[PDB]
């Protein structure tokens, strides 16, 4: 019926999300008016005419028979009770002659993936807030829904102008992932070393992801393979085979934050996430109370401030 521990101001924001959600009944494809494209891997910044609103919408080709969609939407409905300051609240789900359309909150700031491109490298002071939000987010899921993200990427950490940080693209629909298996791989991985080998992916799997992603955030480059000698030498300011990348992840030592440039506290943080052994790796507790996390939580940061001072808006 509610939740435990909520910020006074966030309690305001989240409350509005609900009142504005009761305004929308069904989900007519016509009610939505396509506006601008966003991303793909597809999302559009459309607008709902009836509720006179602008919500973010994702949808991907799926020629699944009517028999299937009904169950997918059923599991997908679970998303409703999944409301948190650290989660991109959604609205509903529907078909479209041959595709599923997920409707959710619009984070105008885009995923940290985009932001990391229009900033080159991300300040540690900020990654702290990010780390916190992420940890609380993942914590919220597991505790309140037994659900784990399963897919943690910088491209899935949405951040709006409110200086808010929320997660998205987290696997909640079981039956959907069946048809949603057999898909894009790419050249940058986030599979925890244990997974590549077979071990069940605990919530600690997402931790490795977070850890890995964090590193990419600071150095402004996908950590693996680690920079050469003249590469990293010229980075401070202000071409492989898929199997080889993976094999490296499994046998070679993980990425490390360049010393000197970052606090030793923070280094230890990412280090505690990138422990290649699941059991030996930090749990969502150790991290929540880690020297680094403790600091950044009190560290006064004009997030949204500098935020709109890099990507504008």
């Amino acid at each position: 019926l509610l939740e435990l521990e909520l910020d006074e101001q966030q309690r305001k924001r989240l409350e509005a999300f609900l009142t504005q959600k009761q305004k929308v009944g069904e989900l007519k494809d016509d009610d939505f008016e396509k506006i601008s494209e966003l991303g793909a891997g597809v999302v559009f910044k459309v607008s709902h005419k009836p509720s006179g609103l602008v919500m973010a919408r994702k949808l991907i080709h799926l020629e699944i028979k009517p028999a299937i969609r009904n169950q997918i939407i059923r599991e997908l409905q679970v998303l409703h009770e999944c409301n948190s300051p650290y989660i991109v609240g959604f609205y509903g789900a529907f078909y479209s002659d041959g595709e599923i359309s997920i409707c959710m909150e619009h984070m105008d700031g885009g995923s940290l993936d985009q932001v990391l491109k229009k900033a080159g490298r991300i300040p540690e002071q900020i990654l702290g807030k990010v780390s916190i939000a992420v940890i609380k987010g993942l914590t919220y899921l597991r505790e309140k829904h037994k659900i784990m993200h399963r897919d943690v990427k910088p491209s899935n950490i949405l951040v709006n102008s409110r200086g808010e940080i929320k997660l998205c693209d987290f696997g909640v629909s079981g039956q959907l992932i069946d048809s949603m298996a057999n898909s894009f791989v790419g050249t940058r991985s986030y599979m925890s070393p244990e997974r590549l080998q077979g071990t069940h992916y605990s919530v600690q799997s997402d931790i490795w992801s977070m850890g890995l992603s964090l590193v990419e955030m600071a150095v402004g480059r996908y950590p693996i393979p680690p920079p050469d000698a003249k590469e990293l030498e010229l980075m401070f300011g202000c071409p492989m085979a898929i199997f080889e990348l993976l094999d490296y992840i499994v046998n070679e030592p993980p990425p490390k934050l360049p010393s000197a440039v970052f606090s030793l506290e923070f280094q230890d943080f990412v280090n505690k996430c990138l422990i290649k052994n699941p059991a030996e790796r930090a749990d969502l507790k150790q991290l929540m109370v880690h020297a680094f996390i403790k600091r950044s939580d009190a560290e006064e940061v004009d997030f949204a401030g500098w935020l709109c001072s890099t990507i504008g808006l």
Binding site: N182, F184, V185, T187, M191, F243, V250
Partner: protein, 265 residues
């Protein structure tokens, strides 16, 4: 630049029917080359006017092939814009679908028989010196047993589909992100792919039934062939399974030696 007249089979009127082709390469329609055939429309990609050996020498060679275990190659035709390949419509069920059909008996001998055919066909294509490359389970039909869709390799950051990944031998599974053809496709590439179909026959599901893409890639990459003995299992079978999957493409059996083993029980 090829026309239907250059083909054995007499053609005058070819009429398309209702689409039935999802697939990667082009769409497949239940058409009528006078008779009842299956038409695949692989609309040509722009430019690339330097692919003679690719078809001026390849596809035309699919003429003069004719086996009881291979789909009939009715013929194709490359226009300036589009491309279309005709082929005998198989009036049966794909091996994929039947090997998973709501409970069908299929013994171990009924299994051996299935494998007998697949290798007879692949052997034929071997002698003709033509690589199948993509020998999936979903590319075998049951009228008897018929192979199909051989030699079909003529899109931004690598899109890996279904169980296709678990048919690629080690040599191949080390693949670039861009790069989809011109991999280490050997004649062993094919014998390997067969192995996985065999596992499929006995396990009624294909290997790594649950692992992600990256997992298969790394696992099959390090040559981590899945279990063999699982109640019920059976020796003999277990053995041949490894041979087909041998990590060194040299250590793998040739279709003609594999057909021999296949007949020993």
């Amino acid at each position: 630049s090829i026309f239907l007249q250059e083909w054995d089979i007499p053609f005058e009127q070819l009429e398309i029917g209702e689409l039935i082709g999802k697939g990667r390469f082009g769409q497949v329609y239940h058409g009528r080359w006078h008779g009842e055939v299956a038409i695949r429309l692989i609309d040509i990609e722009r430019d690339n006017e330097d692919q003679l050996k690719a078809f001026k020498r390849e596809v035309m060679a699919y003429r003069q092939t004719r086996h009881e275990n291979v789909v009939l190659f009715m013929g194709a035709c490359m226009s300036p814009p589009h491309l279309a390949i005709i082929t005998s419509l198989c009036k049966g069920r794909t091996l994929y679908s039947v090997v998973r059909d709501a409970k069908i008996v299929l013994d171990v001998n009924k299994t051996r028989q299935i494998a007998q055919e697949i290798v007879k066909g692949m052997g034929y294509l071997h002698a003709k010196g033509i690589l199948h490359k993509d020998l999936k389970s979903k590319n075998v039909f049951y009228d008897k047993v018929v192979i199909t869709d051989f030699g079909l390799f003529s899109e931004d950051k690598l899109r890996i589909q279904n169980g296709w990944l678990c048919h690629l031998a080690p040599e191949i599974i080390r693949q670039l992100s861009p790069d989809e053809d011109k991999l280490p496709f050997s004649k062993h590439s094919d014998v390997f792919a067969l192995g996985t179909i065999w596992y499929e026959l006995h396990a009624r599901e294909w290997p790594f039934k649950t692992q992600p893409a990256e997992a298969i890639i790394w696992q099959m990459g390090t040559g981590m062939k899945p279990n063999l003995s699982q109640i019920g299992m059976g020796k003999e079978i277990s053995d041949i399974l490894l041979f087909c999957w041998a990590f060194e493409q040299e250590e793998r059996p040739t279709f003609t030696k594999l057909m021999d083993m296949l007949e020993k029980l």
